[PDB]
Amino acid sequence: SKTITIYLDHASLPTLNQLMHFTKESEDKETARIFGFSRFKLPEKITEQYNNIHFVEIKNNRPTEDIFTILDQYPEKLELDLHLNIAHSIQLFHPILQYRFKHPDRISIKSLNLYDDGTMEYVDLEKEENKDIKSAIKKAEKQLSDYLLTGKINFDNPTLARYVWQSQYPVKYHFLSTEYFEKAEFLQPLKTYLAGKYQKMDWSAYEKLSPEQQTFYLKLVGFSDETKQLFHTEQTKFIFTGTTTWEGNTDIREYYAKQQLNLLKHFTHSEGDLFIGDQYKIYFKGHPRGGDINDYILKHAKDITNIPANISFEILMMTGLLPDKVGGVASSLYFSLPKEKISHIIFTSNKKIKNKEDALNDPYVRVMLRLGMIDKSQIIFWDSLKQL
Ligand SMILES: Nc1ccn([C@@H]2O[C@H](COP(=O)(O)O)[C@@H](O)[C@H]2O)c(=O)n1
């Protein structure tokens, strides 16, 4: 066989993981890789050292037909190691299935590594609390069997269907929060079904890396020495973390930036509802896909060290550069933080939240209550805050 290692992700959290996986094999310059992001994302000094590396576009949660053209170039017998995100695993797989119908004996699936895309996985599970989890698993297994036979997507329970890949392939899951699966009683049947099949997105597997692997990785993910110097001062440190939306609308986008800067004001200003104290030096960490929203913040923010948006927050924990305090809008990044470092986590919603009972029905709120990253007495959505 020839092995082909296919990384289908471009979102920050799964791609951060996948880039470390790749790092562990980086000396092998020969093996074929496919990445689901731009050829320009990574340093060309690094990528041009690789002989069988290609980059493919993901559109509407599927790789484009370029992946067919890329795999057509390998006439040998092929084993595919797929790395894909849990939330969209079904859609991302659709074209791989299509291609296998054309090349069944030459094209086999050696393994799946399935990583959380973010917190969507967790807010979708919240909606499943009163359902019969045991039978949903069985139903999903059969429907995945049909998917593999027909190539057609039909799942009664798309959320739970994400977790039944083991009934067809060798699979290993990497979870943002293993605890959610132990602490959520309704998920006991799922926890049992998946026993042995999962690990946590640890980030302590960065320690395991060679000192040289470490240096390579940091160049992949874009952490330089400048960025390291940003934290030289012995002064104590607060990082404001930003967010984004997946919406092309001006006003939805401006709304965001406006709310967010305002929110920053409330942590930093002594007139603020969340004022942290004058001891802290302030840093900004924009959302990787926040674009203009990050810009607006940097246009208006006095007295603030930017940590370039494209650097995933979790690198700070790997490298030991984590601050004393962190605050901002709810994000996957908080799931990595020791609790004493949290200043405040703020929520958003399309629904106007008028009271505590509205608040409690928010599924992100529920996730964080379930994991005890917040308690009930302090729930804040950012519209309820005032302009400063
Ligand atoms: N302010 C932010 C927000 C997200 N992120 C990155 O994006 C990932 C997903 O965050 P969201 O759940 O906020 O989309 C995080 O795990 C992190 O790697 C960041 O580096 N800085």
mmCIF file of all heavy atoms in Angstrom, residues 2 4 32-34 51-56 65-78 80 99 103 106-107:
data_model
loop_
_atom_site.group_PDB
_atom_site.id
_atom_site.type_symbol
_atom_site.label_atom_id
_atom_site.label_comp_id
_atom_site.label_asym_id
_atom_site.label_seq_id
_atom_site.Cartn_x
_atom_site.Cartn_y
_atom_site.Cartn_z
ATOM 1 N N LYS A 2 0.330 2.350 -0.460
ATOM 2 C CA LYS A 2 0.844 3.642 -0.092
ATOM 3 C C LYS A 2 -0.141 4.197 0.948
ATOM 4 O O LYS A 2 -1.364 4.078 0.773
ATOM 5 C CB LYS A 2 0.949 4.549 -1.321
ATOM 6 C CG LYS A 2 2.197 5.380 -1.310
ATOM 7 C CD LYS A 2 2.145 6.539 -2.282
ATOM 8 C CE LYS A 2 3.006 7.662 -1.714
ATOM 9 N NZ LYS A 2 3.181 8.865 -2.569
ATOM 10 N N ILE A 4 -1.923 7.401 2.565
ATOM 11 C CA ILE A 4 -2.236 8.807 2.398
ATOM 12 C C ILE A 4 -2.902 9.328 3.676
ATOM 13 O O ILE A 4 -3.974 8.834 4.098
ATOM 14 C CB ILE A 4 -3.250 9.068 1.271
ATOM 15 C CG1 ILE A 4 -2.991 8.219 0.026
ATOM 16 C CG2 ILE A 4 -3.243 10.553 0.941
ATOM 17 C CD1 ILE A 4 -1.694 8.519 -0.689
ATOM 18 N N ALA A 32 2.446 10.843 1.485
ATOM 19 C CA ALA A 32 1.503 11.734 0.904
ATOM 20 C C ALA A 32 0.596 12.330 2.003
ATOM 21 O O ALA A 32 0.012 11.578 2.798
ATOM 22 C CB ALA A 32 0.690 11.006 -0.144
ATOM 23 N N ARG A 33 0.521 13.671 2.030
ATOM 24 C CA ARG A 33 -0.470 14.401 2.816
ATOM 25 C C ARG A 33 -1.422 15.244 1.954
ATOM 26 O O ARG A 33 -1.035 15.888 0.981
ATOM 27 C CB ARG A 33 0.204 15.315 3.841
ATOM 28 C CG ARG A 33 0.871 14.568 4.987
ATOM 29 C CD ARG A 33 2.280 14.114 4.658
ATOM 30 N NE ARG A 33 3.085 13.922 5.855
ATOM 31 C CZ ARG A 33 4.411 13.788 5.886
ATOM 32 N NH1 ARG A 33 5.147 13.845 4.774
ATOM 33 N NH2 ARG A 33 5.013 13.632 7.051
ATOM 34 N N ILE A 34 -2.663 15.293 2.391
ATOM 35 C CA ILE A 34 -3.596 16.268 1.920
ATOM 36 C C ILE A 34 -4.143 17.071 3.077
ATOM 37 O O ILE A 34 -4.556 16.511 4.079
ATOM 38 C CB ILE A 34 -4.745 15.569 1.218
ATOM 39 C CG1 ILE A 34 -4.175 14.732 0.046
ATOM 40 C CG2 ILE A 34 -5.704 16.624 0.678
ATOM 41 C CD1 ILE A 34 -5.213 13.909 -0.666
ATOM 42 N N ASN A 51 7.403 16.269 -0.685
ATOM 43 C CA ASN A 51 7.296 15.849 -2.068
ATOM 44 C C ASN A 51 5.924 15.461 -2.513
ATOM 45 O O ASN A 51 5.670 15.498 -3.711
ATOM 46 C CB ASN A 51 8.210 14.667 -2.317
ATOM 47 C CG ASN A 51 9.645 15.045 -2.101
ATOM 48 O OD1 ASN A 51 10.133 16.004 -2.704
ATOM 49 N ND2 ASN A 51 10.314 14.355 -1.179
ATOM 50 N N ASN A 52 5.055 15.070 -1.573
ATOM 51 C CA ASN A 52 3.717 14.542 -1.923
ATOM 52 C C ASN A 52 2.649 15.151 -1.019
ATOM 53 O O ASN A 52 1.922 14.485 -0.309
ATOM 54 C CB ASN A 52 3.775 13.037 -1.812
ATOM 55 C CG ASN A 52 4.707 12.432 -2.847
ATOM 56 O OD1 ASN A 52 5.881 12.103 -2.572
ATOM 57 N ND2 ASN A 52 4.209 12.343 -4.057
ATOM 58 N N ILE A 53 2.587 16.469 -1.068
ATOM 59 C CA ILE A 53 1.740 17.255 -0.194
ATOM 60 C C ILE A 53 0.837 18.105 -1.104
ATOM 61 O O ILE A 53 1.292 18.680 -2.077
ATOM 62 C CB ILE A 53 2.627 18.089 0.761
ATOM 63 C CG1 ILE A 53 1.790 18.878 1.730
ATOM 64 C CG2 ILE A 53 3.528 19.075 0.005
ATOM 65 C CD1 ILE A 53 2.638 19.557 2.782
ATOM 66 N N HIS A 54 -0.459 18.124 -0.833
ATOM 67 C CA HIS A 54 -1.405 18.884 -1.646
ATOM 68 C C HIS A 54 -2.376 19.573 -0.741
ATOM 69 O O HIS A 54 -2.507 19.195 0.416
ATOM 70 C CB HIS A 54 -2.152 17.965 -2.609
ATOM 71 C CG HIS A 54 -1.280 16.903 -3.177
ATOM 72 N ND1 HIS A 54 -0.701 17.007 -4.416
ATOM 73 C CD2 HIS A 54 -0.830 15.742 -2.642
ATOM 74 C CE1 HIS A 54 0.058 15.954 -4.636
ATOM 75 N NE2 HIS A 54 0.000 15.171 -3.574
ATOM 76 N N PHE A 55 -3.043 20.588 -1.267
ATOM 77 C CA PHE A 55 -3.953 21.397 -0.461
ATOM 78 C C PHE A 55 -5.255 21.473 -1.187
ATOM 79 O O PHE A 55 -5.267 21.735 -2.386
ATOM 80 C CB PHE A 55 -3.394 22.796 -0.161
ATOM 81 C CG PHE A 55 -2.050 22.774 0.530
ATOM 82 C CD1 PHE A 55 -0.872 22.686 -0.213
ATOM 83 C CD2 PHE A 55 -1.961 22.821 1.905
ATOM 84 C CE1 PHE A 55 0.360 22.655 0.411
ATOM 85 C CE2 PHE A 55 -0.732 22.804 2.527
ATOM 86 C CZ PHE A 55 0.436 22.713 1.791
ATOM 87 N N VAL A 56 -6.346 21.238 -0.459
ATOM 88 C CA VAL A 56 -7.649 21.135 -1.062
ATOM 89 C C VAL A 56 -8.640 22.055 -0.349
ATOM 90 O O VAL A 56 -8.522 22.328 0.833
ATOM 91 C CB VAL A 56 -8.092 19.651 -1.138
ATOM 92 C CG1 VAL A 56 -8.480 19.094 0.215
ATOM 93 C CG2 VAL A 56 -9.274 19.486 -2.070
ATOM 94 N N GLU A 65 -13.971 18.501 -5.556
ATOM 95 C CA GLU A 65 -13.585 17.413 -6.429
ATOM 96 C C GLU A 65 -12.138 17.361 -6.828
ATOM 97 O O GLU A 65 -11.694 16.395 -7.440
ATOM 98 C CB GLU A 65 -14.482 17.405 -7.636
ATOM 99 C CG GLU A 65 -15.871 16.951 -7.212
ATOM 100 C CD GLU A 65 -16.861 16.919 -8.346
ATOM 101 O OE1 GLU A 65 -16.473 17.214 -9.503
ATOM 102 O OE2 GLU A 65 -18.038 16.612 -8.062
ATOM 103 N N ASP A 66 -11.384 18.360 -6.421
ATOM 104 C CA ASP A 66 -9.952 18.329 -6.517
ATOM 105 C C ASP A 66 -9.339 17.187 -5.758
ATOM 106 O O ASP A 66 -8.176 16.812 -6.018
ATOM 107 C CB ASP A 66 -9.345 19.588 -5.898
ATOM 108 C CG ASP A 66 -8.715 20.513 -6.920
ATOM 109 O OD1 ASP A 66 -8.583 20.176 -8.122
ATOM 110 O OD2 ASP A 66 -8.302 21.578 -6.477
ATOM 111 N N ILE A 67 -10.044 16.708 -4.742
ATOM 112 C CA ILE A 67 -9.489 15.607 -3.970
ATOM 113 C C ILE A 67 -9.468 14.358 -4.837
ATOM 114 O O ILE A 67 -8.555 13.576 -4.720
ATOM 115 C CB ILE A 67 -10.239 15.364 -2.634
ATOM 116 C CG1 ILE A 67 -9.434 14.432 -1.755
ATOM 117 C CG2 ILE A 67 -11.642 14.794 -2.854
ATOM 118 C CD1 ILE A 67 -9.753 14.601 -0.305
ATOM 119 N N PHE A 68 -10.455 14.218 -5.728
ATOM 120 C CA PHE A 68 -10.499 13.096 -6.662
ATOM 121 C C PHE A 68 -9.292 13.171 -7.569
ATOM 122 O O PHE A 68 -8.592 12.168 -7.760
ATOM 123 C CB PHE A 68 -11.764 13.109 -7.541
ATOM 124 C CG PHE A 68 -13.056 13.064 -6.779
ATOM 125 C CD1 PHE A 68 -14.235 13.553 -7.360
ATOM 126 C CD2 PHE A 68 -13.128 12.532 -5.483
ATOM 127 C CE1 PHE A 68 -15.451 13.515 -6.667
ATOM 128 C CE2 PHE A 68 -14.345 12.493 -4.794
ATOM 129 C CZ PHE A 68 -15.506 12.980 -5.380
ATOM 130 N N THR A 69 -9.049 14.364 -8.116
ATOM 131 C CA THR A 69 -7.927 14.582 -9.013
ATOM 132 C C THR A 69 -6.603 14.303 -8.295
ATOM 133 O O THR A 69 -5.747 13.617 -8.837
ATOM 134 C CB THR A 69 -7.982 15.996 -9.579
ATOM 135 O OG1 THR A 69 -9.334 16.297 -9.967
ATOM 136 C CG2 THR A 69 -7.055 16.137 -10.767
ATOM 137 N N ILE A 70 -6.457 14.772 -7.051
ATOM 138 C CA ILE A 70 -5.270 14.494 -6.287
ATOM 139 C C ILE A 70 -5.059 12.979 -6.081
ATOM 140 O O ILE A 70 -3.960 12.477 -6.239
ATOM 141 C CB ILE A 70 -5.260 15.165 -4.894
ATOM 142 C CG1 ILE A 70 -5.194 16.699 -4.997
ATOM 143 C CG2 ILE A 70 -4.045 14.697 -4.093
ATOM 144 C CD1 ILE A 70 -5.647 17.398 -3.737
ATOM 145 N N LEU A 71 -6.089 12.256 -5.661
ATOM 146 C CA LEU A 71 -5.929 10.832 -5.395
ATOM 147 C C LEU A 71 -5.705 10.039 -6.683
ATOM 148 O O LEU A 71 -5.042 9.055 -6.649
ATOM 149 C CB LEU A 71 -7.170 10.267 -4.663
ATOM 150 C CG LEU A 71 -7.283 10.806 -3.263
ATOM 151 C CD1 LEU A 71 -8.617 10.472 -2.669
ATOM 152 C CD2 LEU A 71 -6.138 10.303 -2.404
ATOM 153 N N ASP A 72 -6.316 10.455 -7.777
ATOM 154 C CA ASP A 72 -6.019 9.915 -9.128
ATOM 155 C C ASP A 72 -4.545 9.888 -9.457
ATOM 156 O O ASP A 72 -4.113 9.106 -10.256
ATOM 157 C CB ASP A 72 -6.732 10.719 -10.254
ATOM 158 C CG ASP A 72 -8.203 10.418 -10.333
ATOM 159 O OD1 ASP A 72 -8.596 9.374 -9.766
ATOM 160 O OD2 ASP A 72 -8.974 11.210 -10.940
ATOM 161 N N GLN A 73 -3.755 10.738 -8.848
ATOM 162 C CA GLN A 73 -2.363 10.704 -9.130
ATOM 163 C C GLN A 73 -1.616 9.579 -8.440
ATOM 164 O O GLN A 73 -0.411 9.462 -8.637
ATOM 165 C CB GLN A 73 -1.743 12.038 -8.746
ATOM 166 C CG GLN A 73 -2.289 13.174 -9.584
ATOM 167 C CD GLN A 73 -2.047 14.527 -8.941
ATOM 168 O OE1 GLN A 73 -1.537 14.624 -7.799
ATOM 169 N NE2 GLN A 73 -2.421 15.588 -9.662
ATOM 170 N N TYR A 74 -2.270 8.767 -7.608
ATOM 171 C CA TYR A 74 -1.540 7.708 -6.911
ATOM 172 C C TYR A 74 -2.125 6.393 -7.368
ATOM 173 O O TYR A 74 -3.148 5.971 -6.830
ATOM 174 C CB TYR A 74 -1.670 7.871 -5.406
ATOM 175 C CG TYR A 74 -1.071 9.132 -4.893
ATOM 176 C CD1 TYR A 74 -1.876 10.215 -4.504
ATOM 177 C CD2 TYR A 74 0.298 9.268 -4.780
ATOM 178 C CE1 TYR A 74 -1.322 11.403 -4.049
ATOM 179 C CE2 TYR A 74 0.860 10.442 -4.307
ATOM 180 C CZ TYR A 74 0.038 11.515 -3.948
ATOM 181 O OH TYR A 74 0.600 12.669 -3.476
ATOM 182 N N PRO A 75 -1.502 5.747 -8.381
ATOM 183 C CA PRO A 75 -2.073 4.542 -8.939
ATOM 184 C C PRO A 75 -1.913 3.316 -8.043
ATOM 185 O O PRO A 75 -2.583 2.323 -8.254
ATOM 186 C CB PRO A 75 -1.243 4.334 -10.216
ATOM 187 C CG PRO A 75 0.130 4.764 -9.812
ATOM 188 C CD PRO A 75 -0.152 5.999 -8.940
ATOM 189 N N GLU A 76 -1.019 3.367 -7.074
ATOM 190 C CA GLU A 76 -0.775 2.218 -6.187
ATOM 191 C C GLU A 76 -2.035 1.854 -5.371
ATOM 192 O O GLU A 76 -3.092 2.515 -5.458
ATOM 193 C CB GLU A 76 0.415 2.505 -5.253
ATOM 194 C CG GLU A 76 1.622 3.200 -5.913
ATOM 195 C CD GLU A 76 1.624 4.742 -5.821
ATOM 196 O OE1 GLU A 76 0.556 5.368 -5.868
ATOM 197 O OE2 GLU A 76 2.709 5.355 -5.704
ATOM 198 N N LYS A 77 -1.932 0.776 -4.617
ATOM 199 C CA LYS A 77 -2.939 0.397 -3.616
ATOM 200 C C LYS A 77 -2.834 1.387 -2.422
ATOM 201 O O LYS A 77 -1.715 1.714 -1.973
ATOM 202 C CB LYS A 77 -2.714 -1.041 -3.161
ATOM 203 C CG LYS A 77 -4.010 -1.754 -2.843
ATOM 204 C CD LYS A 77 -3.771 -3.216 -2.529
ATOM 205 C CE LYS A 77 -5.063 -4.006 -2.642
ATOM 206 N NZ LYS A 77 -4.956 -5.260 -1.846
ATOM 207 N N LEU A 78 -3.967 1.915 -1.967
ATOM 208 C CA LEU A 78 -3.934 3.059 -1.027
ATOM 209 C C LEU A 78 -4.702 2.839 0.261
ATOM 210 O O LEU A 78 -5.868 2.441 0.241
ATOM 211 C CB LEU A 78 -4.487 4.327 -1.682
ATOM 212 C CG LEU A 78 -3.862 4.856 -2.961
ATOM 213 C CD1 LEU A 78 -4.537 6.143 -3.385
ATOM 214 C CD2 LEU A 78 -2.371 5.114 -2.810
ATOM 215 N N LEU A 80 -6.072 5.022 3.510
ATOM 216 C CA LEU A 80 -6.366 6.431 3.872
ATOM 217 C C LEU A 80 -6.543 6.596 5.375
ATOM 218 O O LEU A 80 -7.438 5.980 5.968
ATOM 219 C CB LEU A 80 -7.652 6.893 3.177
ATOM 220 C CG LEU A 80 -7.731 6.767 1.667
ATOM 221 C CD1 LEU A 80 -9.030 7.373 1.201
ATOM 222 C CD2 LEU A 80 -6.556 7.456 0.998
ATOM 223 N N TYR A 99 -15.790 8.362 -4.119
ATOM 224 C CA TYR A 99 -14.572 7.954 -4.816
ATOM 225 C C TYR A 99 -14.304 6.484 -4.629
ATOM 226 O O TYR A 99 -13.838 5.820 -5.549
ATOM 227 C CB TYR A 99 -13.355 8.765 -4.332
ATOM 228 C CG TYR A 99 -12.078 8.589 -5.116
ATOM 229 C CD1 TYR A 99 -11.947 9.143 -6.390
ATOM 230 C CD2 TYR A 99 -11.016 7.890 -4.619
ATOM 231 C CE1 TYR A 99 -10.771 9.019 -7.128
ATOM 232 C CE2 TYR A 99 -9.817 7.758 -5.355
ATOM 233 C CZ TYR A 99 -9.721 8.343 -6.611
ATOM 234 O OH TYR A 99 -8.594 8.254 -7.383
ATOM 235 N N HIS A 103 -13.352 2.974 -6.961
ATOM 236 C CA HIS A 103 -12.048 2.353 -6.773
ATOM 237 C C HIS A 103 -12.007 1.453 -5.535
ATOM 238 O O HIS A 103 -11.058 1.492 -4.733
ATOM 239 C CB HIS A 103 -10.959 3.436 -6.671
ATOM 240 C CG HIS A 103 -10.960 4.425 -7.805
ATOM 241 N ND1 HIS A 103 -10.126 4.313 -8.898
ATOM 242 C CD2 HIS A 103 -11.675 5.560 -7.994
ATOM 243 C CE1 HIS A 103 -10.347 5.322 -9.720
ATOM 244 N NE2 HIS A 103 -11.274 6.099 -9.189
ATOM 245 N N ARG A 106 -8.760 -0.778 -4.546
ATOM 246 C CA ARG A 106 -7.496 -0.065 -4.444
ATOM 247 C C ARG A 106 -7.499 0.979 -3.312
ATOM 248 O O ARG A 106 -6.447 1.394 -2.807
ATOM 249 C CB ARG A 106 -7.237 0.617 -5.771
ATOM 250 C CG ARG A 106 -5.779 0.959 -5.981
ATOM 251 C CD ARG A 106 -5.577 1.253 -7.449
ATOM 252 N NE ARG A 106 -6.426 2.366 -7.830
ATOM 253 C CZ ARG A 106 -6.129 3.624 -7.578
ATOM 254 N NH1 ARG A 106 -4.994 3.920 -6.957
ATOM 255 N NH2 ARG A 106 -6.964 4.583 -7.952
ATOM 256 N N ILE A 107 -8.698 1.400 -2.945
ATOM 257 C CA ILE A 107 -8.894 2.492 -2.015
ATOM 258 C C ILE A 107 -9.520 1.935 -0.756
ATOM 259 O O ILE A 107 -10.689 1.561 -0.760
ATOM 260 C CB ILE A 107 -9.843 3.537 -2.643
ATOM 261 C CG1 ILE A 107 -9.115 4.262 -3.782
ATOM 262 C CG2 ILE A 107 -10.357 4.546 -1.628
ATOM 263 C CD1 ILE A 107 -7.709 4.747 -3.440
#
